[PDB]
């Protein structure tokens, strides 16, 4: 087969690292770690990474490399009835692209807004500011009334978001042309990065996957030298071992590691499908997973040095400084830090460029998974003319993201990020692991891995894939189902119909798998036993 291959091994490694290293490594993991015991949380995170995310990462990489097919078509070679998984994954991508890119747009907007001599989120003198605004790092002579807001909070909520113009999820308001242009530029960059395939995405990730680390090192050096950063680092690391007793800590570690590594989104599979057959996907999986986890740790150091600095300038514990987190931590809290620190313009420019790149590499990977899946599944129509299909994918993602550009767009972004990554994607990943372990047989998968690498996976990997990784995903799914999210943003309690809409989004993502199972059973003739067996067995070309 004349299939495309990575120009260089570094291209694949950096593509995977950029995929797994997103803004979640920077603002999800550190907040979750501090909330769940700080240093103690490194014990769940590690454990659920060793027996959880990493086995699935390696399994997906090996599967994609061996079968050299995308998310949709690969199930022809593993378990045909589960072909619907592919389509489900595609839908998930859309939902992700509906909000993911929007967040990047915000960063881009901030980036542009950060090119001024004085950062616009520095003072309360601006048009968007209201009477509640008060300088965050003001002298103690002026008290911080509970109703007060910081200038950066005003800039985020009223200038860029204009959230004040939306009464909630029911009244999103109009579309902000500024964010519309920002996301249009974002999608132009995305398209022109992933329109010729891996031969261009691999080269683009050289900048989009390494630059975030350069900026992270710069920001770590900046924060470590800030006054009061040691207190922030101590809060980050001070272990609350009692938190390990709570099940919620382990639940959060599981969810964080799964959604950080991203095993089960059809993206690692698509990236591996371009690897050379005999390439070592075991080493690649280990290297990329440890890189992602260490990036999460280092970015937590970066964030919490600054949080401790901010907690020192205000005589407050880091708990009040962090508040509630979200994008409201890199756009309000950290943005306040940049505004206060010297050389604020340069640090803001690099910080928001880092956010843009951290998002861009992951979006490249997420959309490339879908593009590869469709290209492999329907080559008779898309094998050529790939550029126009990628254009169609980008246009569809932009149209899906239009709702997130409204003045109530932040509410929709939070809704999607809470429900797009709900138990639907976890169930899809669990069914992937089950199909490749039980239905396809762990022995056959290990034989394929031996044929690729030359050595069969050890008993640890077999046990993980067969029992623990499916059990890991099932544990997360049960956690998500038996605890609905009471999600809240900007003192706006989400309504119950929003929860029902999130359930609808999740099922629409997942309802592809049962629908295709029923379709495949119906089409295949024979009795029910044969009707099922003939479709479980991988098709032989």
């Amino acid at each position: 087969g004349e299939r495309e291959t990575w120009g260089k091994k570094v291209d694949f490694l950096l593509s995977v690292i950029g995929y797994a290293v997103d803004l979640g490594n920077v603002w999800r993991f550190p907040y979750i770690c501090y909330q769940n015991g700080g240093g103690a949380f490194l014990l769940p995170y590690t454990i659920m990474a060793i027996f959880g995310g990493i086995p699935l990462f390696y399994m997906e990489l090996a599967l994609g490399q061996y079968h050299r097919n995308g998310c949709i078509s690969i199930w022809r070679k593993i378990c045909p009835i589960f072909k619907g998984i592919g389509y489900a994954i595609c839908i998930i991508a859309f939902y992700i692209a509906s909000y993911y890119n929007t967040i990047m747009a915000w960063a881009l907007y901030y980036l542009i807004s950060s090119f001024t001599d004085q950062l616009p989120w520095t003072s309360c003198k601006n048009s968007w500011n209201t009477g509640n605004c008060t300088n965050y790092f003001s002298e103690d002579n002026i008290t911080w009334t509970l109703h007060s807001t910081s200038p950066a909070e005003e800039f985020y909520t009223r200038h860029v978001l204009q959230i004040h113009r939306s009464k909630g999820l029911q009244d999103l308001g109009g579309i902000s042309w500024q964010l519309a242009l920002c996301i249009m530029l974002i999608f132009t960059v995305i398209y022109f990065s992933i329109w010729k395939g891996v031969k261009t995405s691999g080269k683009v990730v050289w900048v989009t996957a390494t630059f975030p680390y350069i900026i992270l090192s710069v920001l770590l050096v900046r924060g470590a030298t800030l006054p009061g950063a040691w207190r922030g680092v101590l809060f980050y690391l001070k272990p609350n071992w009692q938190k390990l007793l709570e099940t919620g800590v382990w639940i959060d570690a599981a969810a964080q590691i799964f959604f950080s590594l991203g095993p089960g989104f059809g993206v690692l599979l698509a990236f591996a499908s371009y690897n050379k057959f005999n390439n070592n996907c075991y080493q690649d999986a280990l290297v990329t997973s440890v890189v992602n986890c260490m990036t999460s740790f280092v970015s937590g150091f970066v964030i919490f040095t600054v949080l401790g600095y901010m907690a020192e300038m205000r005589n407050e514990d880091v708990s009040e400084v962090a508040k509630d987190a979200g994008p409201s931590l890199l756009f309000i809290t950290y943005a306040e830090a940049i505004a206060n620190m010297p050389a604020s313009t340069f640090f803001a420019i690099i910080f928001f460029l880092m956010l843009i790149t951290l998002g861009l590499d992951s979006t490249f990977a997420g959309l490339e998974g879908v593009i590869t899946a469709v290209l492999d599944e329907f080559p008779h129509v898309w094998a050529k003319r790939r550029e126009r299909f990628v254009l169609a994918v980008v246009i569809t993602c932009f149209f899906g993201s239009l709702v997130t550009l409204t003045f109530g767009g932040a509410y929709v972004v939070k809704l999607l990020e809470e429900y797009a990554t709900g138990p639907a994607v976890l169930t899809v990943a669990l069914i992937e692991a089950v199909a490749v372990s039980w239905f396809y047989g762990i022995t056959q998968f290990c034989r394929d891995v031996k044929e690729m690498l030359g050595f069969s996976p050890g008993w640890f990997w077999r046990i993980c894939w067969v029992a623990i990784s499916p059990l890991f995903l099932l544990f997360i799914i049960c956690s998500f189902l038996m605890s609905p999210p009471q999600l809240r943003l900007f003192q706006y309690n989400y309504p119950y119909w929003s929860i029902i809409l999130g359930y609808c989004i999740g099922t629409s993502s997942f309802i592809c798998i049962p629908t295709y199972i029923a379709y495949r059973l119906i089409i295949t003739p024979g009795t029910f036993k044969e009707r099922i067996i003939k479709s479980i067995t991988p098709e032989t070309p």
Partner: antibody, heavy 120, light 111 residues
Framework: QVQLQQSGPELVKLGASVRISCKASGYRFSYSWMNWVKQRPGKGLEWIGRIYPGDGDTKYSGKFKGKATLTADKSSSTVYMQLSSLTSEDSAVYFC??????????????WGQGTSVTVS | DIVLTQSPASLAVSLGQRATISCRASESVDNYGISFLNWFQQKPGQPPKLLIYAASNQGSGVPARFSGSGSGTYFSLNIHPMEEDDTAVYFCQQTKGVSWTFGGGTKVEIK
């Protein structure tokens, strides 16, 4: 009770410069633009400029830059205005206003009694 | 520089009738859902008094008879009933641009 107290009536000669003061009270002084507005004897209001004492950021009208310079003194909660190279045209009543906040359209809610500058 | 054109330059009202003063902005003054156009009243020989602190919002202590309306480039101030105490010069100030130019002023006098 917000009270903007301005200087008394001022009489100056041609080509001189004058210091017009506006003392603010009743509100947090550093977080409100202080607008200076001109009003000639027979003509309407004529915005001169504004100063944010918090950052000390002054923005002037196109025809008043250089002619008028605003400054702030947070210790005394005062806003000062230099009119330079005063001519017969500058003879007018000058008002200082609090400018409310951005959410309220920067409305100049509170005003001073006005300083009558007579150039002769 | 946003230019506010008021109309009419002078306006005569029979006592108790409705007074309407129109303002046209060369550029839209709306921003973040806030019109950024204010209406002020000035009695002869007194400092201007804030009248409407937005396109619509009533200035603190302003009687309910005064009412602002409009948005974008066109705004209006309406007085109903026009009491004898309302004879004054009504100005409109745009707080949108860098320079907050005042309006030409409308002299409302009792007929």
């Amino acid at each position: 009770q917000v009270q903007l107290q301005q200087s008394g009536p001022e009489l100056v000669k041609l080509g001189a410069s004058v210091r017009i003061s506006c003392k603010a009270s009743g509100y947090r002084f550093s977080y409100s633009w202080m607008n200076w507005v001109k009003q000639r004897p027979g003509k309407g209001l004529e915005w001169i400029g504004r100063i944010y004492p918090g950052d000390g950021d002054t923005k002037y009208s196109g025809k008043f830059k250089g002619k008028a310079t605003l400054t702030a003194d947070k210790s005394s909660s005062t806003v000062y205005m230099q009119l330079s190279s005063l001519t017969s045209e500058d003879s007018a009543v000058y008002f200082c206003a609090r400018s409310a906040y951005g959410s309220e359209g920067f409305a100049m809610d509170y005003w001073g009694q006005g300083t009558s500058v007579t150039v002769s | 520089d946003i230019v506010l054109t008021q109309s009419p330059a002078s306006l005569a009202v029979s006592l108790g009738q409705r007074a309407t003063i129109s303002c046209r902005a060369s550029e839209s003054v709306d921003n973040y859902g806030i019109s950024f156009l204010n209406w002020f009243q000035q009695k002869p020989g007194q400092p201007p008094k804030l009248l409407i602190y937005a396109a619509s919002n009533q200035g603190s202590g302003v009687p309910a008879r005064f009412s602002g309306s409009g948005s974008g480039t066109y705004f209006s101030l309406n007085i109903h009933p026009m009491e004898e105490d309302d004879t004054a010069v009504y100005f409109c100030q745009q707080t949108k641009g860098v320079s907050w130019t005042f309006g030409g002023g409308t002299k409302v006098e009792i007929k």
